[PDB]
Design an enzyme around this catalytic site. Sequence first.
Site, mmCIF file in Angstrom:
data_model
loop_
_atom_site.group_PDB
_atom_site.id
_atom_site.type_symbol
_atom_site.label_atom_id
_atom_site.label_comp_id
_atom_site.label_asym_id
_atom_site.label_seq_id
_atom_site.Cartn_x
_atom_site.Cartn_y
_atom_site.Cartn_z
ATOM 1 N N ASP A 9 0.884 -1.135 0.000
ATOM 2 C CA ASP A 9 0.000 0.000 0.000
ATOM 3 C C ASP A 9 0.952 1.221 0.000
ATOM 4 O OD1 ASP A 9 -1.922 2.004 0.546
ATOM 5 O OD2 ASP A 9 -2.007 1.494 2.682
ATOM 6 N N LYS A 69 3.037 11.417 -3.897
ATOM 7 C CA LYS A 69 1.803 10.821 -4.434
ATOM 8 C C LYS A 69 0.885 11.888 -5.061
ATOM 9 C CE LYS A 69 -1.469 7.213 -3.423
ATOM 10 N NZ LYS A 69 -2.031 6.367 -2.334
ATOM 11 N N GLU A 174 -6.990 0.706 -4.470
ATOM 12 C CA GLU A 174 -7.007 0.718 -2.995
ATOM 13 C C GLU A 174 -8.350 0.259 -2.396
ATOM 14 O OE1 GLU A 174 -5.470 4.612 -1.909
ATOM 15 O OE2 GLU A 174 -3.568 4.112 -2.897
ATOM 16 N N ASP A 197 -12.525 5.851 3.080
ATOM 17 C CA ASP A 197 -11.076 5.900 3.323
ATOM 18 C C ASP A 197 -10.619 7.286 3.764
ATOM 19 O OD1 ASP A 197 -8.191 5.973 3.044
ATOM 20 O OD2 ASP A 197 -8.164 4.737 1.239
#
Length: 380
Positions: A9, A69, A174, A197
């Site tokens: 992850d 990211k 994800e 999330d």
Amino acid sequence: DVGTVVGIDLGTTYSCVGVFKNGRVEIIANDQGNRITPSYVAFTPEGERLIGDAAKNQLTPENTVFDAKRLIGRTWNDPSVQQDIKFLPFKVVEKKTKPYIQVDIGGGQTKTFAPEEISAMVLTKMKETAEAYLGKKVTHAVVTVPAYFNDAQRQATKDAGTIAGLNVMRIINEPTAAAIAYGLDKREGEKNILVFDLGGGTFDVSLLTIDNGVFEVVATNGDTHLGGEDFDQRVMEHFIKLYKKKTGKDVRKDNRAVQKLRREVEKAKRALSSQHQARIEIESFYEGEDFSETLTRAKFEELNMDLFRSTMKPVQKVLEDSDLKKSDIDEIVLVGGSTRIPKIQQLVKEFFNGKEPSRGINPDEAVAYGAAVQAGVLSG
Ligand SMILES: Nc1ncnc2c1nc(Br)n2[C@@H]1O[C@H](CO)[C@@H](O)[C@H]1O
């Protein structure tokens, strides 16, 4: 040949790694004994490259890279990048049409790294973490990405892997990995899955559909600038304003005093997910003068209520954008350490008129767990 395949992850703020060993998923701890590693890279004036906890916890911010990211697989002129580089303390420049990061790697020596080279550094740390655990070399991996990641963002994550010496066999969404971890794939019929999330810096809501082991992402929403850190920052403001009222001083004048409080506020936030009171303690703090104060669960909730309530808005938008109602949700999956927050849990439950979310896997580990489930099949 493919060896033990790892499930990684690769998060905005934190990263996690898992393996399938002796019939079960194993979430691996780093050299610091932590089951999640900060997606951070720092360079010390001596020339040492620090990755993870050592990079995030180092007291210093121009030469500390994080949030790669947000830039990975994007072009320099991307409006999202342009808006983002306003908040990043490190230098970002245009090179080869991309937003390259510029840092002093020690002794005034300047270097530029593409965002996939920084993610490659984080991926190298994850790989070193797994190799230390397995006692052998890791060559292959399953890497997760957010469901909204486009072609360029997925390819750049694959490139980061290649630089780290990993063959990214599969790029998996994800929310899908989160669902696989809870065994929602192993079900029959058609089901609607809401994945909530709330990570360190990003908030993602995904509506997925499972039809006979086959996932489909129907709609995505969230807020790219809402996460756990925003909660830390609200607490930071409260203690900076209080220290001003109690001493007349401005904590923000000393950067290391701010970093010390930031680390203590983050530990305290985690404690208030289980207990009702936490104490912060820092020596000397500021001007030699010590820091000792308490935070209640009720105050933490009051400082963050508007940020907590704002999470329900994208949940409504995904339902609409998928032509579904609350009654149509069969499974609620909570992802990210921030979903451990009792008020966040209460808010999500009451929105789904008492429906209880899936429980078992730690929400900060669910995505790496799901990735490690897929990695197991691939390992054989
Ligand atoms: N127990 C917890 N209670 C409140 N928050 C937590 C907890 N555990 C984790 Br990990 N976090 C936060 O989740 C984000 C990473 O997913 C970071 O901002 C962490 O601070």
